[PDB]
Amino acid sequence: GPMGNGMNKILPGLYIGNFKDARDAEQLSKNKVTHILSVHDSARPMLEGVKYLCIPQNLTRHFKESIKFIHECRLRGESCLVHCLAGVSRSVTLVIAYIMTVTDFGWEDALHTVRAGRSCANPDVGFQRQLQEFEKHEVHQYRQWLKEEYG
């Protein structure tokens, strides 16, 4: 459906879901989620036991902090949930940017990867164009930055 069927594993330690999934103690416990990257303010208090990164549209300027947050979680064997309102566009864009940086993928191959786990994934055209620009002008330096910081 238009807001998914629950939070979905994309890669080991990386999940995408909607705002409801991000408050679902049963899903969070089952998927051992200890980090949440929120691209939508549910107006509800943060949960205990979880490290948050909250992003208040230009998402490119948030790629670096988002990738660091996800990557440091995954390198320590923990699990991160990225969510927005529907888990279709905003969170998906951030996760595509991450996949592009830890692989040699362009944005379309990264979107294929997200859709393999979360079939409702569908960034809106504005974010597709930001990801196109990212693929052409910046992902190669992000890839080098990741190697210099984390080996």
Author numbering: -1 to 54, 61 to 155
Task: Provide the authors' own sentences about this structure as they appear in the paper.
This enzyme is broadly expressed in different tissues and plays important roles in the regulation of signaling pathways, such as inactivating the T cell receptor (TCR) signaling pathway, activating the JNK signaling pathway, and regulating the phosphorylation of focal adhesion kinase (FAK). The phosphatase domain of DUSP22 consists of five twisted β-sheets and six α-helices, and the structural scaffold is similar to that of DUSP3 (VHR), while DUSP22 does not contain an N-terminal α-helix surrounded by the N-loop.
Structural alignment among N128A, N128D, and WT_VO4 revealed that N128 participated in forming the conformation of the D-loop. These results clearly indicated that the N128-D57 interaction anchored the D-loop and stabilized the conformation of the active site. N128A and N128D increased the KM more than 30 times, but the kcat values were different. N128D decreased the kcat by 16 times, while the kcat of N128A only decreased 2.5 times. In the N128D structure, the charge repulsion induces D57 to be unable to interact with S93 and substrate, which decreases the kcat.
